[PDB]
Design a protein around this nucleic acid. Structure first.
Lengths: 280, 78, 267, 78, 280, 267
DNA sequence: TTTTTTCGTAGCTGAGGCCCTCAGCTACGTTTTTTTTTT
DNA sequence: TTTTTTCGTAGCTGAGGGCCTCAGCTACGTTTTTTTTTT
């Protein structure tokens, strides 16, 4: 007859898969990539947290529907692999979770508590007492400049700042290209995680007002432990196509660091600092 | 999380695709994946619910002596 | 919020414009400035370039069934704008504001003011009473045997034809309402009368217009007693949504509902 | 020691039995076992040496991201 | 065409398998048991260290040949599961190993050193100094009685001594039946190990003159850590046919204790105490 | 010492006696006291009861090829008796005893006393020289082209027909010799001339009788140049072993060889 | 200045073909070499 | 008081059959229900 199709836990999944140049269809209820020559490739879409769609892909209505049904995030990436768009289940969010997050964000004191927790998790020490959100922003930014400088010195990479040109990908450094791609991967799995946990990516605490604010918040906590160093290591080699090497490196990092298994507890831990009783 | 193999015989196309949602089809009716116990059980109720006339064997990795266990749906000589 | 429904074709880009393509060539030409939201119906295929362009201009892509009788997937998932979500959330979290919004919903739904001495939870019984009365009147009007609303959430076949039809109809309604809510930039999960469910707000809004159009057609079709009554109801709801422009009318209604909190709306 | 699956197709009887020396045949041409890397490599040179005209896929559990790897002998659509 | 068939390492194998009532054949070069109704059961003979043949089995020449080729020991067991006979490759032993063992056994001083090592490994403390082999035997026997008494009182089993009747299995009590079966399993895997390591089961140090002397020696070292306590645990329950429960238990113990992986290093360690330089 | 060869049938027990059974009923009746050793040839099947009986009376079961041209498996593996193994071991481990035994082997093989002033290692060159001479004489006698003994241990097809035949022949000889050594209760691996190999003793003993029977047959068959010469050689060796009672004659020879150590033999 | 039905996918069915299994027959007991370069 | 060919297993081959795959056609956009016990 017929049986319902439900998402499996995020931690139980491969982190991401990259697809390019072919049409994505559904055949007998399965996700399938077909290239220009007719070669059919089957994608275990339910076993992945993120499917990254590169230029030249053409996705059927049925495929987008299927990805949403199994809870796999579709991410469209452009040049230098930057995230450009995403697709997922709109009715995926949980009201108690959403309202919990909203309550924490709307209250400046609770918001401050959550920001302080983010700071402590990110830097391994408490933030100086009685500092506003903006002051914490400044401290965080300063420490980040220091981290970029240090990584550059360790991997022996020339660093002239975080710079990219929105109108031309060739205008940026190789290192910045790498950082952009790596960060892109991290934001992919992070957005997937935030959505799976039932929260809204747009409601953030350090970063606010953007459609991916909370994603920025969460990713920033662990981005310099994991992906950015690997970006400097790859940039050091000056590769031809540094994107694919960065994407593979990030996959390996996510597996060895068990990032998917860690992201949802990280989110819950961060929000719990508001000291309002959590849902569930 | 342990290795999983599903071998199907004479099952309708919808089960063939359904398994392709989580597992990799390396041969006709031969699917491979790495899943947890509860996902393995979910896949099994998919099988029992869709195999219809066909028959299926599902084998997975364990810490038992032989290193694996397996269960079947429908009939088969083996 | 302007929008367009696209069906049976590939959505691509030509000269910085959205384009629907057939075996027959270009079917529909869409200038980037003319739609905020593109609703993709079954049989559609989206090119990477089209998504890239949509991202540049901030166009929402929603994957729906015919005429939005189902909502399958959405771009900007979890909502594009913080201010809209936080506005809605603020209205839902404050009991005074929540009460105002619920009163507005009551007014829009029944055409008369909500009684003032009652809380939301208390307004509820009244709504239920009127819904029972309306079902009864419709039953007598279309001459359908009705002993009340009965359905099994876990089994579709145990109900009689009329309840089966009502269920199919409301299902479609939940489709267009969710699409409307997404186009308007709000969260389906944050409700006022209905709370705690992933589609709470959808239920809230759908209840306002549920008895004007859709439920009556459920009764008309039930009376006709066709072979596949659920499928006939879905198709009928599709045709209604198209000819009467239900989705386009829902969005101002949603904004109007939320504005009753008497708090400044997002720009 | 990790789980091993060998799927054979149109292979001579002697390979069919040879595999049955170390692995359990759960379906026609579908063998399961738990072996070390070097025994796996042993089994693979048996396969390459006896499969003749037929074709074979061998998949095993790993510590890689998908949790398994696989290699093939002869050609096959998949 | 044809490829040679070689034994896999002992530690990589399932410990033992019990076969009864059917004819064992070779079909297309594989070990196969066929019962009275024609049902074929395939046995991964190369994956087992030990195959135990119960009454009603009938083994073809080809099967015995095959078992020897893959280095799997065939053991014929009788009533109460006692080992009765065994079959293996005759040319399996290694000259350096055999002569090493023989040299250690023929010299009374070296022999004493090996016996002392066995004692220390078995009881976890050194044997009292300047004691002969026979004096050590007496000490060992005393400690073994004490151990039987202790196990008996702990599992609440009536113990009237180690007694069995060679002419009737029904004449012995249940606990002794269990001990006999359990010990049988242990001797099975031990003989398999000794043979695989290239040594002679007949050349022992504590026990001498018997065809399985070295097996007795080695098994006795670990016999009371593993197998005998479970014989008591099973005996307390008074089961109908204690044999199959004992076999199952011994399998589980061998797996959890990694007995197969430990046996060859145990043998080498024991022989090494003679302080004669080992083979390779 | 006493033994019997069984083929094509099931070995079972009837009334406390060994029995060979085929579809024609009882083929061979064997009283328990009459054999120390049962050699099981291809086509045989062993019942549990027979093994149980053999264990009771101490009968050695050996799984061999026809006439013992191959030794496949053996009961009491690694040898039944400690005293026999330790006797052989003592003889091999002591250089004086070893020398005595090797001298006896030389005498039995060539019919003349070994030179007194040479050690075992030195006796080797002499033995090798005589082997070269014997191959030469046989080659001239059977009219076979011989440029010496050449074989590839890793590839059988590289040799000419005569060396191929010789190899097949010696292979069979190693079979019956190993069978004899097992029946006598000694270890194939403990050798005197040959050392370090798993079949060292087998090589030692086989070399003693190798040129009487088997190698000449390798030459005769090589001369005849048949279709499958290796297989013809194996069959011929089988027939020789049967008609000449090679296995039965080898056992007293083995005992004599070891007795030359002038140490008290096992009871 | 209209009468524009076009795309993606599942179910069904018959043809084609691959290959798994077994019965019935014939053949065979076997995958070898042990300090090799003759006299 | 002889003329006793008998067993276990692999290779080969043809018949049978099960099932995997795909082309060609038709049908359909769907697996629903949101505080239910009428007036």
């Amino acid at each position: 007859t017929w049986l319902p199709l439900n998402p499996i836990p995020l931690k139980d999944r491969v982190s991401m898969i990259f697809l390019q140049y072919g049409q994505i269809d559904v055949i007998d209820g399965a996700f399938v990539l077909i290239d220009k020559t007719g070669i059919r490739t089957h994608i275990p879409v339910g076993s992945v947290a993120c499917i990254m769609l590169e230029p030249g892909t053409r996705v059927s209505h049925a495929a987008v529907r299927l990805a949403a049904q199994v809870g796999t995030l579709l991410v469209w990436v452009g040049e230098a692999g930057v995230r450009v768009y995403a697709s997922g289940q709109p009715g995926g969010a949980r009201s108690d979770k959403l309202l919990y997050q909203a309550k924490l964000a709307l209250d400046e004191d609770l918001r401050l508590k959550v920001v302080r927790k983010m700071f402590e998790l990110r830097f391994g020490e408490p933030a100086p007492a009685r500092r506003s959100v903006e002051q914490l922003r400044g401290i965080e930014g300063s420490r980040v400049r220091a981290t970029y400088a240090l990584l550059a010195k360790q991997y022996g990479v020339t660093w002239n700042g975080r710079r990219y040109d929105p109108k031309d990908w060739e205008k940026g450094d190789t290192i910045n290209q790498c950082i952009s791609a790596a960060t892109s991967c991290l934001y992919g799995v992070t957005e997937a995680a935030i959505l799976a946990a039932g929260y809204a990516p747009a409601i953030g605490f350090v970063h606010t007002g953007k459609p991916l604010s909370f994603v920025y918040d969460i990713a920033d906590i662990i981005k310099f432990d994991t992906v950015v160093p690997k970006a400097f290591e790859i940039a050091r080699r000056n590769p031809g196509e540094p994107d694919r090497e960065v994407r593979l490196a990030c996959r390996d990092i996510f597996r060895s660091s068990k990032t998917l298994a860690k992201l949802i507890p990280l989110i819950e831990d961060v929000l719990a600092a508001g000291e309002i009783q959590p849902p569930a | 999380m342990s290795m999983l193999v599903v071998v199907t015989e004479n099952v309708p196309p919808r089960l063939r695709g359904r398994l392709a949602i989580w597992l990799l089809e390396v041969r006709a009716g031969v699917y491979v994946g790495d899943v947890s116990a509860k996902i393995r059980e979910m896949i099994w109720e998919q099988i029992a619910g869709l195999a219809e006339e066909g028959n299926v064997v599902m084998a997975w990795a364990t810490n038992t002596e032989t290193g694996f266990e397996f269960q079947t749906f429908g009939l088969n000589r083996r």
